Amino acid sequence: GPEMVRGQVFDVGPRYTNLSYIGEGAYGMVCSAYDNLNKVRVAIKKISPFEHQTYCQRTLREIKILLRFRHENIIGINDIIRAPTIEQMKDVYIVQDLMETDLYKLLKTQHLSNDHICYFLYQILRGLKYIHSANVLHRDLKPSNLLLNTTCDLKICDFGLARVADPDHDHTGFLTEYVATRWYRAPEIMLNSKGYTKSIDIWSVGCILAEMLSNRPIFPGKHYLDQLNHILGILGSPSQEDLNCIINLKARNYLLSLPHKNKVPWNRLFPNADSKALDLLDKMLTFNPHKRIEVEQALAHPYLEQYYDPSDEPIAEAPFKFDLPKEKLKELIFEETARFQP
Numbered sequence: 425g426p427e428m429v430r431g432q433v434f435d436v437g438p439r440y441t442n443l444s445y446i447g448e449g450a451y452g453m454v455c456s457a458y459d460n461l462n463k464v465r466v467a468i469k470k471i472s473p474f475e476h477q478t479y480c481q482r483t484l485r486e487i488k489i490l491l492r493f494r495h496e497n498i499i500g501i502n503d504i505i506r507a508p509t510i511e512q513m514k515d516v517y518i519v520q521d522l523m524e525t526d527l528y529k530l531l532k533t534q535h536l537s538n539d540h541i542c543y544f545l546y547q548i549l550r551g552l553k554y555i556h557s558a559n560v561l562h563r564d565l566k567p568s569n570l571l572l573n574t575t576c577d578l579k580i581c582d583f584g585l586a587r588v589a590d591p592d593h594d595h596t597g598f599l600t601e602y603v604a605t606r607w608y609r610a611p612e613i614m615l616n617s618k619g620y621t622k623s624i625d626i627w628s629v630g631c632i633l634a635e636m637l638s639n640r641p642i643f644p645g646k647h648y649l650d651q652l653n654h655i656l657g658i659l660g661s662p663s664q665e666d667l668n669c670i671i672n673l674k675a676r677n678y679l680l681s682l683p684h685k686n687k688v689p690w691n692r693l694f695p696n697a698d699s700k701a702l703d704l705l706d707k708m709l710t711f712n713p714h715k716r717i718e719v720e721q722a723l724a725h726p727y728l729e730q731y732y733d734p735s736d737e738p739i740a741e742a743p744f745k746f747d748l749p750k751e752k753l754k755e756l757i758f759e760e761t762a763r764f765q766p
């Protein structure tokens with residue numbers, strides 16, 4: 425029969441042998457395995473998404489994006505295993521490079537040197553430059569979505585919430601629900617934005633940088649609106665100029681109802697930090713999204729001077745472009761995964 429793991433079938437042979445459990449998840453099970461072809465250990469995730477239209481959609485979205493991206497700092501798909509017919513296809517197995525750890529697990533346990541912080545940040549921005557150049561927003565950047573191997577190469581993963589940028593359709597009402605991870609949400613999400621512009625990823629990168637400096641999340645809101653008050657407590661009350669950019673009255677009047685708060689200077693929160701890192705942090709964590717630095721300007725910042733090399737920071741060859749019943753989604757997943765057969 426097929427090899428089994430923790431009371432579940434993991435039908436990936438013959439190429440992939442000698443499995444070990446390494447993780448459950450709400451999306452499915454991850455095992456490591458021996459690739460008998462390349463003679464390396466890989467990671468394999470088993471997904472069973474076809475009973476739910478929502479999992480089908482996220483699965484298909486991420487497959488199409490990762491198959492089209494090719495970049496050293498973005499996780500790739502090595503292989504996809506599934507049944508030879510649509511009728512027999514109940515599960516899909518995705519094969520990726522095995523990564524040692526992620527930035528979330530690293531920060532819980534390790535102090536980072538300024539050299540590591542700088543190198544990690546450079547790789548995040550280098551990968552983000554390629555992503556944005558393709559007109560895609562990640563929208564859920566956080567430490568657990570940044571994987572690392574044993575030599576500190578970093579790869580961005582988890583494109584399940586990614587969208588094509590759509591700035592003309594970004595506006596929305598006060599307190600509109602959002603799905604990405606609370607601590608790393610840009611303030612405009614809670615006020616007037618659907619998160620369809622590149623500036624929301626830069627905010628999340630600024631949060632990750634702050635978290636690398638201190639080993640703890642800088643804005644750990646308990647709930648939707650607590651998140652905003654954590655932000656203003658450090659950045660201070662927005663200026664009149666920045667309020668004038670918020671035209672929705674509910675959002676503007678909420679901010680006007682709050683007590684005045686002054687900015688807390690970064691160097692008081694992070695006394696050990698490199699002052700160039702704090703200058704870049706300041707420009708990433710700007711309240712007003714139109715004043716927030718873009719990814720190419722961040723790469724050119726003096727903090728990153730020993731790595732910056734635009735001729736070695738590739739952009740995508742063409743911008744990326746894409747209500748369906750699950751039956752059609754299943755058919756679409758079948759079609760996209762065909763190139764890995766037999």
Ligand SMILES: Nc1nnnn1NCc1cccc(OCc2ccccc2)c1
Nearest residue numbers: 467468469483486487518520521522523
């Ligand atoms: N790559 C890696 N190393 N350790 N863990 N880990 N990855 C989590 C993971 C492993 C293997 C395949 C994975 O892919 C999930 C995915 C789901 C849907 C579409 C495309 C890919 C994820």
